[PDB]
């Protein structure tokens, strides 16, 4: 029997319920589940949608959570669902119950801590080749990357690496949404277009350089899609940068041999985001430090120890959780 390798092949909810009978939590798990269920049911009550639609959705979600195979998948996916639900519900928050827009704080922190307005620096001179070079990681690889990371981490990573990936990705995006709602901020194209004056939630967003991309390949793909968005002032912390950093950290954790590639990818994505005038550098750095700390916790916790002689998941015959106490250089005088 190769239990570690194989997924769950049982289909009876009784097993799940008896596991919940058996499982023992700690304060970590108490606050985890209390917080996540809190957000879930808050979204249930809020989020204007027909009550029958919402009841059916949550009932299907529950019966998907409770059946062992789909249970393990979607129960681990839980934080991602919380992120998505809270994001759209927050799109349905009321206009004058959310904080005022800070159009002056991000340029201040950036010019103070990093020299100049780096978005303006990288956008001083633009052309078509650079427009495409920025369009790729912004609009294509950003959206395709979480699923590719899941597939590659599932096959080539050790077992249960994907659980930690789901946990870290979900909590990163959740804290990102919470901090975007707590602290609103106008992205750089706002200073480019209007300048320094004060904003309000009754103005439409703008693409930036994706407008040039739209002109290039003749659609209107992005102008309409942006200019009626609800996260216009949602440019702190970065979520493009946070996601890119999380994906690259997990690639560098699972594949430690071809590592420079992923750092080059992240720098490509940061340049792409500040090229199209969608972020300040402090935005990307809030996102990146958030993702970094989250991943450090999740790696010196939950995540297992990768092996280097083993090809793919189905050749891993053990789960090995990291150990803070032994591994430290500043040991207990073991020799």
């Amino acid at each position: 029997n190769c239990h570690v390798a194989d997924l769950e092949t049982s289909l009876d909810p009784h097993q799940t319920l008896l596991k919940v009978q058996k499982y023992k939590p700690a304060l970590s798990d108490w606050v985890h589940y209390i917080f996540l269920g809190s957000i879930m049911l808050f979204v249930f009550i809020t989020n204007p949608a027909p009550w029958i639609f919402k009841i059916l959705f949550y009932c299907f979600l529950g019966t998907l959570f409770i059946i062992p195979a789909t249970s393990q998948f979607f129960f681990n996916a839980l934080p991602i669902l919380t992120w998505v639900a809270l994001y759209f519900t927050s799109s349905y928050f009321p206009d004058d119950r959310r904080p005022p827009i800070t159009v002056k704080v991000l340029p201040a922190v950036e010019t103070i801590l990093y020299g100049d307005n780096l978005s303006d620096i990288l956008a001083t001179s633009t052309n078509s080749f650079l427009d495409i070079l920025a369009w790729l990681p912004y609009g294509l690889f950003h959206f395709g990357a979480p699923f590719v990371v899941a597939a590659i981490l599932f096959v080539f990573g050790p077992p249960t690496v994907l659980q930690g990936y789901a946990f870290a990705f979900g909590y990163m995006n959740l804290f990102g949404v919470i901090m975007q709602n707590v602290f609103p901020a106008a992205p750089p194209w706002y200073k480019i277009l209007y300048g320094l004056q004060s904003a309000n939630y009754d103005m439409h967003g703008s693409p930036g350089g994706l407008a040039r991309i739209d002109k290039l390949l003749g659609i209107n793909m992005y102008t309409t899609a942006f200019s009626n968005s609800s996260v216009i002032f949602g440019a702190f912390p970065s979520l493009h940068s946070g996601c890119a950093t999380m994906e690259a950290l997990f690639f560098c954790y699972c594949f430690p041999k071809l590592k420079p590639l992923f750092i080059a990818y992240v720098c490509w994505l940061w340049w792409s985001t500040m090229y199209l005038t969608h972020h300040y550098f402090v935005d990307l750095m809030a996102g990146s430090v958030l993702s970094y700390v989250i991943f450090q916790y999740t790696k010196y916790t939950h995540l297992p120890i990768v092996d280097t002689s083993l090809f793919c998941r189905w050749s891993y015959t053990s789960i090995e959780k990291y150990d803070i106490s032994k591994s430290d250089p500043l040991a207990a005088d073991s020799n």
């Binding site: 609009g139 959206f143 793909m221 899609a225 996601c243």
Partner: peptide, 8 residues
């Protein structure tokens, strides 16, 4: 898809 825009 309007999340973190892809097509709808």
């Amino acid at each position: 898809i309007v999340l973190x825009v892809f097509f709808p």
